[PDB]
Amino acid sequence: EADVPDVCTNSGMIAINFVDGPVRGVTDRILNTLDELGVKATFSFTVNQKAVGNVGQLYRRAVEEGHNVALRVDPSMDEGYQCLSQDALENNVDREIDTIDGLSGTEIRYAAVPICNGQVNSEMYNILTERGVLPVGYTFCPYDYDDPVGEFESMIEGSDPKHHSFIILMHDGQEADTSRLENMVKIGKDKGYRFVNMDECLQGYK
Ligand SMILES: [Ca+2]
Ligand SMILES: [Ca+2]
Ligand SMILES: [Ca+2]
Ligand SMILES: [Ca+2]
Ligand SMILES: [Cl-]
Ligand SMILES: [Zn+2]
Ligand SMILES: [Zn+2]
């Protein structure tokens, strides 16, 4: 397996990575909240299902509002990258990258694939990086805990922004009510962190 970054390349930053959207209505509201709060983030969106109705514009909206769009690689492949033919695996990924580049009007630079202890499948790592796409990890996921906002606050308040940074993994579908997000932003800002997109979080990686 291949190591992936699980913190930013410099201190003082919180990079939220919203993963497995877009979700009709839910994602639109998250984007509204981020815009109002003046924060930048990252959305690792899927493209394994055709975007229905007003979902399609979300891929472009995220980029236009200063966020990064990353590819959440086809979740139906999660069980095992080694289990499909190398060709099947790679062809699918390549098509998804072309699709999300199209929908977002950009060239993606990042992806979200399954992680184990800060590492991803090497075959998948190689497929992405030969295309100039870096799979990313995360420092903390609030859903790993009984009290998500409390554990977040405990971690942030115990840290020091002059030395620390965080990539925080969230899911659109789990934030249908945006109060937790609002609260997490306040907590981070009160402690002195800047909320950044993945481009800024991972500047100069390697
Ligand atoms: Ca704005
Ligand atoms: Ca605006
Ligand atoms: Ca091939
Ligand atoms: Ca520093
Ligand atoms: Cl604005
Ligand atoms: Zn594992
Ligand atoms: Zn999850």
Swiss-Prot record:
Gene Ontology molecular function, alphabetical: chitin deacetylase activity
Domain (NodB homology): residue spans on this chain: 12-196
Protein name: Polysaccharide deacetylase domain-containing protein ECU11_0510
Disulfide bond annotation, renumbered to this chain: none
Lineage per the UniProt record: Eukaryota, Fungi, Fungi incertae sedis, Microsporidia, Unikaryonidae
GO term, biological process aspect, one: carbohydrate metabolic process
